[PDB]
């Protein structure tokens, strides 16, 4: 609706290159929107727990050890059962 | 390095913004999160382009993106 | 890490109509004695834009563990086409195979699920009221997608410091 909520991190061609580097050949015109919603949940949820580690170390900087577990709540996907 | 720093680091902000008031990343953590960023999409690609491909289409569609976040593991 | 893995998991009837059930089977290994319960849950996606229409197909839940390579089956009812928007009935979708220990979600298996008039006539001009009896379904079956997550398994043992 307003200028702070239309905020980007990534800009159409990086989605394009992205697209590409994961094998995508061709694009509805609507995944720019999609994929910059995506993204926006996902920093959401590792920038919350990043946070939260940050306050309980007495911290007011946010740091890379932080951000590495935070992102182990993910999971780890592949394919198979290996 | 798909992913451009200045405009990735500003959404990071406003977002932890929503978080706490005044608490910077420190350089590496920003990268941490860039490069976490590009290896996250870059997987979602790689499924939605799976989605489509099983769907007998060419072209991804935003369907393909929200399954591709069922198919990963969503939450 | 992890007392219970999976070790595999065979897709046994498929292709298959839409109202055929799902036959699956699921191996898994189990490290050591565990308090608690696991469970195996089968999800289908009835619509991507929201979990609302998300049908739970079948359940199995086990306890207590028995130590070593365990078997099990699912032929699971199928979804309900009433429950899903008629818009995306005939089209790809997913299903979740997923497994929690404690309550605590370890491991997920997704597949792609397409779906398919079986005429060539409906298959070009899909009638406004689907016909279900002229579904068939295609589980990707070569390329489950599987993802663990790393929870705690002994809450006497170990201690979460962030608990939810
Ligand atoms: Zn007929």
Redesign the pocket.
């Known amino acids: 609706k307003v200028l702070r909520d239309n905020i980007q991190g990534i800009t159409k061609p990086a989605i394009r290159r992205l697209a590409r580097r994961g094998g995508v050949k061709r694009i509805s015109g609507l995944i720019y929107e999609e994929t910059r919603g995506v993204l926006k949940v996902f920093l959401e949820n590792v920038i919350r727990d990043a946070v939260t580690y940050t306050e309980h170390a007495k911290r007011k900087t946010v740091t890379a050890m932080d951000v590495v577990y935070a992102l182990k709540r993910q999971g780890r996907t592949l394919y198979g059962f290996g | 390095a798909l992913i451009r720093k200045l405009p990735f680091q500003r959404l990071v902000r406003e977002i932890a913004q929503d978080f706490k008031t005044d608490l910077r990343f420190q350089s590496s953590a920003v990268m941490a999160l860039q490069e976490a960023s590009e290896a996250y999409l870059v997987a979602l690609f790689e499924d939605t382009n799976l989605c489509a491909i099983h769907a007998k289409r060419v072209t991804i569609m935003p369907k393909d993106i929200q399954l591709a976040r069922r198919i990963r593991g969503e939450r | 890490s992890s007392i219970v893995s999976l070790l595999g998991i065979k897709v046994l009837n498929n292709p298959a109509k839409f109202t055929d059930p799902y036959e699956f089977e699921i191996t898994f290994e189990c490290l050591e004695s565990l308090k608690h319960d696991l469970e195996w849950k089968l999800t289908y996606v009835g619509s991507s834009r929201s979990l609302d229409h998300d049908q739970e197909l079948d359940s199995i839940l086990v306890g207590p563990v028995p130590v070593g390579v365990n078997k099990f089956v699912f032929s699971a009812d199928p979804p309900s086409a009433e429950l899903i928007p008629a818009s995306e009935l005939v089209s790809v979708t997913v299903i979740l195979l997923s497994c929690s220990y404690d309550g605590r979600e370890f491991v997920r298996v997704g597949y792609y699920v397409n779906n398919e008039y079986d005429?060539e006539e409906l298959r070009e001009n899909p009638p406004a009221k689907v016909?279900v009896?002229?579904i068939v379904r295609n589980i990707l079956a070569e390329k489950p997608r599987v993802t663990r997550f790393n929870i705690v398994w002994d809450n006497e043992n170990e201690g979460d410091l962030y608990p939810p």
């Open positions: 005429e016909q009896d002229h």
